[PDB]
Symmetry: D2
Amino acid sequence: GTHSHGLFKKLGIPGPTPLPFLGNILSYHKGFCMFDMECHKKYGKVWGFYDGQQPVLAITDPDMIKTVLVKECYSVFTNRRPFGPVGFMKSAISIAEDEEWKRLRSLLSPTFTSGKLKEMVPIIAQYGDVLVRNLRREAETGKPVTLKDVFGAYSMDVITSTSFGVNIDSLNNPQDPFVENTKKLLRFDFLDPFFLSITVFPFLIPILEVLNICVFPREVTNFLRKSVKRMKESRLRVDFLQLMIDSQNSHKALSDLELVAQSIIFIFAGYETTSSVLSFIMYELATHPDVQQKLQEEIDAVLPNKAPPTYDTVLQMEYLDMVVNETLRLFPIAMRLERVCKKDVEINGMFIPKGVVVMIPSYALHRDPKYWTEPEKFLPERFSKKNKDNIDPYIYTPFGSGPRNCIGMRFALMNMKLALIRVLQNFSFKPCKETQIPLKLSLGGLLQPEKPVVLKVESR
Amino acid sequence: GTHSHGLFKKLGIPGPTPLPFLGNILSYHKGFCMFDMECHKKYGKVWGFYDGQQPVLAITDPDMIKTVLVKECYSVFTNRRPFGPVGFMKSAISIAEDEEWKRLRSLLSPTFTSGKLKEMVPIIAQYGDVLVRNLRREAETGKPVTLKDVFGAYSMDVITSTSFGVNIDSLNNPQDPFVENTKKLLRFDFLDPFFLSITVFPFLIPILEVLNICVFPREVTNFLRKSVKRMKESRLRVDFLQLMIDSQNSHKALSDLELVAQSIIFIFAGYETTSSVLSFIMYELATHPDVQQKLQEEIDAVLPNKAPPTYDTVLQMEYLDMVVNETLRLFPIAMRLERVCKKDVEINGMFIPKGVVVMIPSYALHRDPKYWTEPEKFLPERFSKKNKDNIDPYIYTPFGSGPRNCIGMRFALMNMKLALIRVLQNFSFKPCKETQIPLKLSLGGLLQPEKPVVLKVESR
Amino acid sequence: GTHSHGLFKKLGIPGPTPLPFLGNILSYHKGFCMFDMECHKKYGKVWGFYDGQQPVLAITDPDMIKTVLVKECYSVFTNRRPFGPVGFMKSAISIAEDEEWKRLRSLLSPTFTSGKLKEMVPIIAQYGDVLVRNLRREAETGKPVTLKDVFGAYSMDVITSTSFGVNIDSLNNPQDPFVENTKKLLRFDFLDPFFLSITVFPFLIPILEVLNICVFPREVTNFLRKSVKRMKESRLRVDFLQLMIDSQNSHKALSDLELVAQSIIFIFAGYETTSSVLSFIMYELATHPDVQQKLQEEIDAVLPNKAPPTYDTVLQMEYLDMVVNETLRLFPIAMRLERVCKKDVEINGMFIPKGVVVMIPSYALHRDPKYWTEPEKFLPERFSKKNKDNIDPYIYTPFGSGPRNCIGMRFALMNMKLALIRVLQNFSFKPCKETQIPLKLSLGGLLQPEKPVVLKVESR
Amino acid sequence: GTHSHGLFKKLGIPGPTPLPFLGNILSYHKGFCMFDMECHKKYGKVWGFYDGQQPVLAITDPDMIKTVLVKECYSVFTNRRPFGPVGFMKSAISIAEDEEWKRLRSLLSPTFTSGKLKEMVPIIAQYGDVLVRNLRREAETGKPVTLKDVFGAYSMDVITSTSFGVNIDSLNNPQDPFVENTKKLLRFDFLDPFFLSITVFPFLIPILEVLNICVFPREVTNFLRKSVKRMKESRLRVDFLQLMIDSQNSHKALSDLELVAQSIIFIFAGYETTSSVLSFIMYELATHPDVQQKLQEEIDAVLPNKAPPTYDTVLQMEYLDMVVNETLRLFPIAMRLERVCKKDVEINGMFIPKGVVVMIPSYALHRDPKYWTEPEKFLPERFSKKNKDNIDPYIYTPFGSGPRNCIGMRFALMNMKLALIRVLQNFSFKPCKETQIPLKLSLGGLLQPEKPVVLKVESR
Ligand code: HEM
Ligand code: HEM
Ligand code: HEM
Ligand code: HEM
Ligand SMILES: COCC(=O)O[C@]1(CCN(C)CCCc2nc3ccccc3[nH]2)CCc2cc(F)ccc2[C@@H]1C(C)C
């Protein structure tokens, strides 16, 4: 009931005090993000709490953070915490651990190079054209646009074609076989009934693992499993599947089911994340028409006459970059980074017992007054070539840092940027009566707007 | 490991001998139906086995059967066995038990009278017209027809409109909100991984009931729960919802959530059952064109010039009735009837300990040589007014018998008959090269064809 | 997590508000007794709380209490709550439920008549002689006496010989086979780690029931099971075993294992209960030498010259009775009486939903100022023939009331009285320096002294 | 249900075929030992089976065995399989794993040197004198002697005094506090109900670990935990406790609770093991009076006139050694050695997947005709300095081999030898009518006689 509940009181580490069995989870009634702020303010720089019986040690010192993410990554802090029954998805690089992770990490790093990415741009860019045509039809008829559905559909189209060559217009084909399953691959709400129970009955995982109950649905994983065995057997492009089929012709060649595992996790990592950030950005651009106009101006300069964006001209645009980064400062959608302490260690004047989840509260550091002037404000300027220098890369970590960081970072920024470019080239975006202002974050376990973002969309 | 595994060896009752923990479930590798036959042949008239640790006493004596289903129903054998975590669906009349069942049974019996049914015929009959139009378009283009999809869609249309007034053409609207959830309400395969585990880990039910994992999906039950709260609040027809909303204006008036519970179970009881029998019947009529022609002839006689069937002219047709009943003899899709023994009893020279599932092997009795001449053969004649007399109603029980029998019997026969009438009026049905002949039953826990039934469909 | 946690807020019933999963069990940090008082004071006459998810409705109205214990006992409130995995001890009359309880209750009522008891007095009385000899040897050498060990040994001797004819001097034979197991049969601490977990993981019971883990130890129950099969087979006295072997030569004759079940529960009900009350009484008599002297005087009057007590002269003694009853007022060692509500009901202007544990806080009513003048004080007089009249038998219930009350009441009072008589005849009892004064009740789940009672024991 | 059940059929490895859920455990109805022989004969040199879902790869090639036990011990095969909920005893060197094991292994190796052992001989030897006095009193009165009780008591006396300095005559004090708990520390029967369930519900371990249910009893571990905190605090000899208290004044000094953990495991490893081998040896010496006489002769030669054995004269005796070793050949009481495969590997032309329990069937190799002439026969000669050479130390492994072997080997042989010496010096031992001849091994999970060994004991 109190297993390890004296561990932090003992070691000298402060923090809220736990309740038996539940630990501190009642504190999650306002969300991971709000609880992390309060803990930063009211306890300082290091603190501890209990996800049920599991102690979690929050750390906020950039040198200490670097040690965990960078320095001792491979020796002490290699893995994230178990979070549910995962079945065969224990082979997805995100879930695999220790050496199996390192092998998967290596077998996949060449798939995410800039070269591989530059050759996917003409595919990603095609569904930007699709986006504008579907945006225009809703811009034609004066009717508010709900960003999450139009950007949701764009993200889906980008994934089907980048990882499977499946060329869909997911919006206009809302009944395709390939759209129904991939749309069931949403991000996990670790504050919803099931995942909370898993936290205070971690011993229920093995019970579930033996009933073959799985947090990745049996049908989705089954449909994609067989749908990929078709694609492999009809090919025998430039998409993730093929680069992976390539890398299996100094570690053990990528297995068959391991390739299926990665394709599904790429979807999981890329679907809701992308559409959610594109919507946050559109909210900020719609509530600061000066930033929007400025970006539209920077776009028309590089791309004269709605010229089509390319890998190289995308990377030209400084102010676009500043909008993307400043939006991810406010809304880092992972909320936290975490690693399991797998040994006893001392790092930066602090002993850490084997088994503690060490956690880095990204949302709260990105909104720390002590590192950010006027943190609540959308201020794209803080990332200009002028100011970009005094930003610590261990305070601002929307993609994490170190060897276990987001292997999809460059792909995701290039995907979102292509979207925002082709959309601002043709449209302007305005607040509504119904446009929730100021926007409220959800109280749940996902960093998303309370109410969806809806906006007026006009044509240029 | 062997809890109660001597109970039948002791009492004197024969039967296969169990394995620890698993009981006799390895015997289910050929299906409930085949295992029940072998047990009838090789052990006689009474026998016992173990679904894991749970003893099941099979009985085949018509007097003994009557005692269980009819005589001592309310005192000893009131309930079916628990079969999964059910959540709020513990209020569906099928799952409720003891007095709560009797109340629900009474609060719903007037909803299934013949009067209420005769006023639903013009609704049911409308989607017969819809069936023929969709059948014709597939009969127009010479392309094999897969019965389960065209009869699947008809069954869905009949349910939406009979229980919610929702008027859909489910086939041509394969993307309606109301079709996606109700199509996820299929019959349970108690021989599939999950339900088998539930059988040898019955103690896993409470674990699941507390994670709110449920065998009726949370979304389906949630969508229908709210979708009904709309219909109640827009009404404030002749459909099940309204007759139920009626019966809540000597027992406790039907509750709100109890009404939601029944509407979903009516779907569960009526969707796959109906479409599966309609397909079995079409198989038999397509593999005996003499029966088919004879029925077409009996239909044209009562209904001159594709005249539209009515409640009364439907009940006119003897040979139609004989085809429906003879098909349900071969294919009684419940396979077994069961009741939990809730007390110790002696019935017909046999003591039965509290807790035994008493079970009646319908599939095997319907195909018993000792009651049926040439049981394997489709012989509609055995049910004519001439021969219908020497059929024991405790050997032939496709809808069960007694107070807990199928409260939807008359509705289901009238629904299927309306379908078969309007379809034979306009079409003839022929075997294919691909038409699996002879048809094989599935090895799983549902009584359905191994491979789907597909047939040539011509026009008259 | 909150299953039924709105049930009392809804029905209108007040009470502390629950925490998810745990309900109100954090409130048990001071004990059932103290929590029950606070709830009586601060919420009044009726209230509700949650043992995890299980709602418990406390009631304190004598008419309402009578309804539950007496009036609707057989129809609505027949059983106590499940409390642990019990294995075969589900046949002990205390644990059995509904009709199986009524049968066991009837098959055992004639074993507890006054006639049967009067013939056990010469056995019980013999080990009073044994008590005095062992008390004297500790009274001889001036050394404090720890009541729980000398009365513990007396209680054990009374049980072995009353239920099995086994004639031991448990103290001087602290290594007999028959003493080691029966001494492991102590009362359950429902506030200790295991039983608390059972309360907030009631779903863990079936898991345990299938590993054959049992709250009655496998060895104790096994030793006594075989040790009784010896006694049955060597007999083939006046003791419980024989009266039971008798009653199996209008319900089903007592089974073999059912007889073993009762013998163990008689031990469980009678061992720690008796020794604990004898010690409470000795504390009160030692902290009021006037009561003690008065009782010694009433004993010498009826029993001139340490004359040996008999059934009839035991029942002569009014003041003895008043001391026993007043001690059980302060220390009713069951603390609460409970029944499961098995139907919906209205009783005395109150609706009660099926499934609620209805609970009667005996400890708090016995110490209610509103029924007892100076409740904290040991006042034997309130039970004299003069005052015994205005005591409601539904406020003062140390043995419960109604058909499910203590079937061992008369036996227990006669056993304790014989002890107290033969001991006061020969000894006087005095407070020590170490004698905890005032005595503190344990904070756990058993009503016993914090620290053991130790006292000076002199000879007469 | 069949998780990994194709792993051996796939890899090419033969073996009995499994049943769902249970694997091959029905095969354990004759015991680990008999099942291991049949598997050696009927499948050859390598085979696989399933303890439920857990694959176990048996290996019998001395080079392959050496690789696992010696060569790749620290890299691949460091740990034994989890076997039950162990609580804090996860710190006992036997249960600890990976580096924590290596640290414990090092912190304890100097406690088992020959120097430390030679200084414990005068303690061990003292309770040999105690043994002879208690043996004589049973040899005085002509009454069969049950070896397991007289050698059981000797083993207990040797442990209390070697690990805690507690100087008991456990037999004549069968009621000491320190004897009652340590006698509850018997070897685990992994074929008894509980441990078998753990094998096919390994997921039940975490459920138990959270109810603090433990396979080392809470009371035994609690009594010894506090009883050691006394001994530490009264000291602040030459016994295990002190050598351990010593080693905590290049790894982390032995913790407090870690020291308590080791003391209990030393008891667990040493109590039943020793007494069981001493009894096997006495059986063999009593059923071959020529060996016995020969040993008595070799003892009288080194120790003239019942001279007292010393470390050095104990190691003098070749024929004693040959009797001890030949008895452990027949009866290697661990039965199997095992290690978990923690990586994928190829060793001696064989790939082994991560997670397989690799197992070495000691009992069956010790009785392999292909390495042992007349294996069923007790032939002390095979271990003489003449023949001891062609015995492979990877076929004959009564204490295992390699870094994880029995850290108590020398202590155990010296303890048993001192016993056998002082006993044969004074007694001769003869078969009885009741002496089970030939002796049968138990069908359970412990290598012990079916029926106890009883023998005539005469004096010299
Ligand atoms: C705006 C979009 C995205 C954001 C903000 C984001 C952020 C993150 C973060 C914070 C992590 C954990 C980093 C850490 O623990 O240090 C992560 C991991 C990961 N992400 Fe992204 N991500 C995005 C999109 C994508 C995309 C398109 C992919 C496509 C392949 C992807 C694949 C992954 C993978 C595989 C990991 C786990 C890597 C490993 O365990 O070695 N993510 N992401
Ligand atoms: C061909 C179609 C159908 C067949 C063959 C069939 C057969 C059965 C059988 C064998 C039982 C159990 C009988 C027993 O235990 O004695 C049953 C129960 C039931 N059926 Fe039907 N059924 C069909 C369609 C329907 C329909 C359309 C409804 C619509 C309301 C329905 C509602 C129910 C209910 C509520 C029960 C449980 C009744 C109770 O527990 O009191 N069924 N059915
Ligand atoms: C001072 C000693 C004792 C006290 C204070 C005591 C008190 C109680 C109480 C409060 C109950 C529950 C009553 C209820 O729910 O209304 C009970 C039940 C019971 N007691 Fe006693 N008890 C004592 C000794 C004994 C003895 C010696 C026996 C010997 C047979 C015994 C046998 C039982 C049984 C069998 C029940 C359950 C009866 C049933 O469920 O029908 N008890 N006791
Ligand atoms: C006749 C008596 C004994 C026999 C036959 C015996 C045999 C064994 C065997 C086969 C093993 C496992 C070896 C392996 O996996 O390679 C073992 C382990 C062990 N034994 Fe002994 N043993 C005996 C007595 C003792 C005694 C007196 C001690 C006292 C300390 C002891 C302490 C241990 C320990 C601590 C281990 C685990 C070592 C580790 O995991 O590193 N044993 N024993
Ligand atoms: C839900 O919180 C945001 C989130 O989903 O973060 C990840 C999921 C990480 N998962 C492998 C489980 C690890 C345990 C965990 N419990 C958390 C609760 C709150 C906050 C963070 C938590 N971490 C992080 C890495 C990752 C790796 C992939 F391969 C695919 C998707 C993702 C997402 C991220 C891209 C948005």
